Amino acid sequence: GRMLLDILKFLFIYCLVLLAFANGLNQLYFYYETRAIDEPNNCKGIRCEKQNNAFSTLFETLQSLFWSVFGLLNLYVTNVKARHEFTEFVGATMFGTYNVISLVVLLNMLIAMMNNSYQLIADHADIEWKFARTKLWMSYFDEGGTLPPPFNI
């Protein structure tokens, strides 16, 4: 818990990069949005067995780029039924550039600064824990609140 605040600062850097690429992908793919009727077994979105409409809306595009961090977005979502080649290649290049920035650059940056923080924390770990345990102990010294919640009412 002592270095979850450093994670929060990083998660604001990532959210800005996520928003930048989600704007470009949605601005390129929203022309080809299809209704759920035209998709197999009336399923639309990336939660289907056959993923579709990954970048149709901004709300869907933000979820698609989140699940690509864990590799759960298939590559055929960059294809559209019109098959204009140039449009599909540009979209796949936006997707590929986002993967390089996130999974090769930003996440490795998080590892590097997480190692550095742990070195400083480990020296003071014993003092920090004993201070925290003291506050736990003194909370049970008081007479009030002895009974557990099932009986304290």
Amino acid letter, residue 77:
V
106, 113 in Cβ contact below 8 A?
no
Regarding 16 and contact with ligand Y01 (CB under 6 A), the answer is: yes
Residue from 92, 103, 106, 110 that binds ligand A1IMP (CB under 6 A)?
92
78, exposed or middle or buried, with CB in 10 Å at 0-12, 13-18, 19+? buried
Alpha-carbon distances, residue 81 vs 53, 54, 84, 91, 126 (angstroms): 11, 13, 9, 14, 61
CB 28 within 8 A of CB 94: yes
If one asks whether residue 147 binds ligand Y01 (CB under 6 A), the answer comes out as no
Give the residue with the Cβ less far from ligand A1IMP, 36 or 120.
Answer: 36
CB of 123 to ligand Y01, least distance (A): 22
Question: What are the tokens at 50?
Answer: 């056959």
Contact between 103 and ligand A1IMP per CB under 6 A: no
Minimum CB separation of residue 43 from ligand Y01 in Å reads: 31
- Applying CB under 6 A, the residues found at the interface with ligand Y01 are 16, 19
**Binding positions for ligand A1IMP, rule: CB under 6 A:** 11, 15, 59, 62-63, 66, 89, 92-93, 96-97, 100
